[PDB]
Amino acid sequence: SLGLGLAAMGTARQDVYDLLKTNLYQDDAVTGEAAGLALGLVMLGSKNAQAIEDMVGYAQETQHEKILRGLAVGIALVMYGRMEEADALIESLCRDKDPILRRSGMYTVAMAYCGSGNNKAIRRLLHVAVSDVNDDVRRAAVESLGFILFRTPEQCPSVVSLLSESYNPHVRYGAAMALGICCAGTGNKEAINLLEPMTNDPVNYVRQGALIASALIMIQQTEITCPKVNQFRQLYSKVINDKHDDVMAKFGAILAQGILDAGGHNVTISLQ
Amino acid sequence: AVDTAEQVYISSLALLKMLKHGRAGVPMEVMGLMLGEFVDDYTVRVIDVFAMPQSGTGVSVEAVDPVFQAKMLDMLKQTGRPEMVVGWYHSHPGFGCWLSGVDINTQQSFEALSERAVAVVVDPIQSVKGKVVIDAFRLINANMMVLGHEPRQTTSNLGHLNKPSIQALIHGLNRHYYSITINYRKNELEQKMLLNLHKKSWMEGLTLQDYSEHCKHNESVVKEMLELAKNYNKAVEEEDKMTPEQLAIKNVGKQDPKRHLEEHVDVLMTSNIVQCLAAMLDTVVFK
Amino acid sequence: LREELQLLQEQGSYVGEVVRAMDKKKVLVKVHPEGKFVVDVDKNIDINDV
Amino acid sequence: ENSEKIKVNKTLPYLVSNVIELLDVKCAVIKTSTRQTYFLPVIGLVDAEKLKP
Amino acid sequence: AVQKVVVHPLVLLSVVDHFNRIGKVGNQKRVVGVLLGSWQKKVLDVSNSFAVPFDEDDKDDSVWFLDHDYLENMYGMFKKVNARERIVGWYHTGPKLHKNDIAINELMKRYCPNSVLVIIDVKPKDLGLPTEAYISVEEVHDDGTPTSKTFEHVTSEIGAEEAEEVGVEHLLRDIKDTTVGTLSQRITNQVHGLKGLNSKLLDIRSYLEKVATGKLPINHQIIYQLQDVFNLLPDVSLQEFVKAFYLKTNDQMVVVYLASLIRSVVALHNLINNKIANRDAEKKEG
Amino acid sequence: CTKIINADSEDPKYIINVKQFAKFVVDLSDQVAPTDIEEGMRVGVDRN
Amino acid sequence: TRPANHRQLTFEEIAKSAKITVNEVELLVMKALSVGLVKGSIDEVDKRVHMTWVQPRVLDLQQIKGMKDRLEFWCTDVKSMEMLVEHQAHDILT
Amino acid sequence: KQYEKSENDLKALQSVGQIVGEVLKQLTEEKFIVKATNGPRYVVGCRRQL
Amino acid sequence: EFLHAQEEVKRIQSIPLVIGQFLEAVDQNTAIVGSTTGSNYYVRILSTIDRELLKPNASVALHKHSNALV
Ligand SMILES: [Zn+2]
Secondary structure, eight states: OHHHHHHTTTOOOHHHHHHHHHHHTTOOSSSHHHHHHHHHHTTTTOOOHHHHHHHHHHTTTOSOSHHHHHHHHHHHHSOOSOSSTTHHHHHHHHHSSOHHHHHHHHHHHHHTSTTOOOHHHHHHHHHHHHHOOOHHHHHHHHHTHHHHHSSSTTHHHHHSTTGGGOSSHHHHHHHHHHHHHHSOSOOOSSHHHHHHHHTTOSSHHHHHHHHHHHHHHOTTOOTTTOTTHHHHHHHHHHHHHOSSSOHHHHHHHHHHHHHHTGGGTTOOOOOO | OOOOSOEEEEOHHHHHHHHHHHHHTTTTTOEEEEEEEEOSSSEEEEEEEEEOOOOSSOSSGGGOOHHHHHHHHHHHHHTTOOOOEEEEEEEOTTSSOOOOHHHHHHHHHHHHHSSOOBEEEEOTTTOOSSOOOEEEEOOOOSTTTTSOSSOOOSOSOSSSSOOOOHHHHSSSTTTTSOBOOEEEOOOTTTHHHHHHHHSOOSGGGGOOOOSTTTHHHHHHHHHHHHHHHHHHHHHHTTOOOSOHHHHHHTTOOSOIIIIISTHHHHHHHHHHHHHHHHHHHHHHHOO | OHHHHHHHSSOOEEOOEEEEEOSSSBEEEEOSSSOEEOOBOOSSOOSTTO | OHHHHHHTTSOSOOOOEEEEEEEOOOEEEEEETTOOEEEESSOOSSOSTTOOO | OOOEEEEOTTTTHHHHHHHHHGGGSOOSOOOOEEEEEEEOSSSEEEEEEEEOOOOEESSSSOEEOOOHHHHHHHHHHHHHHOSSOEEEEEEEOSSSOOTTHHHHHHHGGGTSTTOEEEEEOSSOOSSSOSEEEEEEOOSSOSSSOOOOOOEEEEEEEEOOOTTTHHHHHHHHOSSOOOSOOTTHHHHHHHHHHHTTHHHHHHHHHHHHHHHHTTOSOOOTTTTTHHHHHHTTOOOOOHHHHGGGHHHHHHHHHHIIIIIHHHHHHHHHHHHHHHHHHHHHHHTTTO | OOEEEEOOTTSOOEEEEOSSSOOEEEOOOSSSOTTSOOTTOOOOOOOO | OOOSSSOOEEHHHHHHHSOOOGGGHHHHHHHHHHHTSOOOEEOSSSOEEEOOOOOOOOOOTHHHHHHHHHHHHHHHHHHHHHHHHHHHSOTTTO | OHHHHHHHHHHSOOOOOOBOEEEEEEOSSSOEEEEESSSOEEEEOOOSOO | OHHHHHHHHTTSSSSOOEEEEEEEEEETTEEEEEETTOSOEEEEOOSSSOSTTOSSOOEEEEOSSSOOBO
16 A cells, blocks of 8 residues: 555545545554555645545544554645645644644644745744643654745754754754754755754764754765765764664664765755 | 564553552552453553452462452443453562562463563552652563564664663563553543642632731841842952952852842742732722 | 752762772772672772772 | 461461560550561450460 | 541542443433442541442332442452441432432441432533532421431542552643742632632522522521621721721832842843943954 | 471471571471471571 | 611610610610620710621511622622733733 | 451451651651661651641 | 752652761762661762751761662
């Protein structure tokens, strides 16, 4: 189903949509990630009557949570850049007390507001970034900053300047990925200035996301373009030949080696 | 088919039966049973907890009464809900949590009966301030004994909920069982009715705590605040260039500057405002 | 303040007088009310510092 | 069944001790061979008339 | 005569779950269970409870079932696991009590003579009432009324215990508000403290409307004779209580010249200390 | 190792001191012959 | 008859309505204080009798009607002036 | 009569002991200084209405 | 959060504490204390106590587990 939803991504084809429904109503715990992701990919940017309604109707009475997290991204991905038409759905998912579904609305407000400097989005998304109690939905708030602000990458170091200096690591984690996805491939040196204490944190996994975001920003950049390239290649090489770190601490390092030389230095990442 | 990073759901009443039965028999390592449901492959939930009578042997397989087993289950089928047992617990007061010698023997009987039968160890007397020392564990086999136990896979929720503590890893833990993750099934229709009903006082908000106890307090605080102002004068009129950030660190006394300042003034502000606002509203409301 | 509170919530140390050192990061210490002990050193302390 | 339960509740490891006095408000003071003084509200599986300091 | 009951916070909770056990088939809208307790003094204590299979029909409204056999053996098990605990009464839910409650209470007074029932409110959880406790008395009647059963009132509260407040604080972790916050918190204590002042007023509003109208019989014993004591209090005699307000000036005096001056002067230090540190770091930058 | 005060008939009922620890009343194990448990004898005693 | 509006009763009203002489109104009210159906006090330079009264009895339904009107004035004073406090201190409430 | 003695024994199975000590001095209204008969010193309180 | 940090600190001193005696002071906020149980210890101390009450000796209160000065 992941292969079928990816190859038929954005088709709005009825026949792949039908057998993905009867895959969803198998009610297996482990294919719920499989049914929910592919059901959004075939309905990407659609805003259908039955697609949102059946998925938001199914996501409460079930008993597992992999079934919920597949439909979490799926109902976020069924709408894409509607920019005003999701607002009844955005208000509906966040007012509920389901923590996964509140997190699902945070990915939905990200994908409906791509690249636009919406004042109503940056007010509301930062509001739940302060006052909410579950850590996972607080991350998807501060992770959704790059999805709405990647068109103007200059504001992103200014607004995540103190988001990287909270007390919990979860806000600091999604702060680190927000530098990685707002600024795509720029030799910024201001975000790199921010990421240097981020990779020197006491907590392990926020250092991991700092290593990945440092890998995302500087693909295909030589030392003469920005002077922080070979500094971090040997920093990646230090922590991967280190012994006494975590598997969590070194998962981002070996992944950073894969990102930095991707495509044989021929391709790049650019949401723009 | 092998283990992953699981998740343990406990009900709100289940944790309350743990700490109450542990607080009851605080010296002598109380014992009980754990009743829940296996919802999938690798998340376990528990809804119910009932205890066991005290055996002279101790925490072992001999403390399990089979006639108290089946007849207690006989009643809970016809009233409430029938469900399958999913495990057990005991209390270990002398330390935090690790499976001891006679702990691990009765575990092998349970995993021969059930699929997993997760153990639960709780110290009742350590949990004092605002946190509970609860952790659940689960035994491993000998087939992967020269291989890496806990065969965990594609997830990232394993590094949380505890690192292996050194008072627990000096015993078994690692090459004998594994640790598992526990969160709480937090629900509505219980949360607010526990909150508002446990801490509440209706008419307290507009009492007066009088004046004869209150003007005396306003009398007292101003007097040392006068000398606190005199000590505040002394540092301000001093004002010497003896490298004043180094002059302040050689004159540390847990004292004046700004710490022993307006902190008192804030208390003098808040006490008289709440006293006078309660005084003015009570003249308004009553006739 | 939170860093100050976590480090205080920790079991205390023992005081013991060193008689004389063994070789390879080992010493010979009676505590106060027990027998003697041959223990290991930490990173920051050395044999020549004993 | 009650006498079977008392049978399995008289273990083995009987820590011997010394009774020093007896009170009523049934009450007794126990000094063990660990030289520790204890006090009870309830005596146990004996008779108070069968006992003495 | 019972002084008051103490609600251990496990029992209510253990009524919510059993209402939720049958709640998938719940159409009886009432759950009877047995209230275990610890008799201490004239004051009463509650520690535990359990349930019982119960049916009832509004048709002939006296046909119902308390399982004595289930009440003997399961309480015998709780006696075996805990010899401290015994029965003190029973409970039911569905906040309107029903006509059968004379029959359940007068039945199981042969288990504990001064038995007591507690009505909880599982669905109403909003304004001002955790529970209520009833008791039975049988005097002649009164000076002149016919005899009856007449469920009476016992005042109630919610108590606690060490090593269960730990379970209270650690399971909630939601709002975590302290009483400190003396500006913001104490004013809101005056706000919703007065939002119950009219709430009890609107309840005493509705009662004498429907008895002055004259529907229900006038309780000549306590229902207004205690109010006849009440309605003279409110003394507002002016020309000496007007002279309460130089003590108001006295309470004002500490606020005005002490707290407004020093708070301003301390923040004025932060100006000169910053304006020095501004430009003396600016003139040394070059 | 410990020392034994005495024994009683039909049962172990063994009364055993340490002279430094307390005085226990314990049972014999399976690996013993119940004849050679004479009084005043040093005997190997379990820890649990 | 006057429910603590101005409960400081003058002596001539007692001496007329009880039709007792003027010199015996003091021995009459000291007896009612001795029994305990009233807990007032007596002035004699002004000869006005101050009243605090705690003894209850029956109230014929008509006095509930006047009690309703006093409770309704009691209602809108509590209700409206709470709306004053809430609307004034709304932003520090939370 | 025999069953009476058995139920008294089932009641008689929770005398977890009490520790015998003596009051050394009074610290505050609800803090005291006591000492065990062979052990250390402590700071304690009363029950509710002692 | 600064008030909840104050609360959990200022309820470390309402516990049925054990009694020891102050023996020596090492440096800033760390000392040697001997208990009434004997077996001399070495713990860290709080941030609240004014240090002018510990000059050769003091009757002091100690924690149960962490055995700190309170
Ligand atoms: Zn154990």
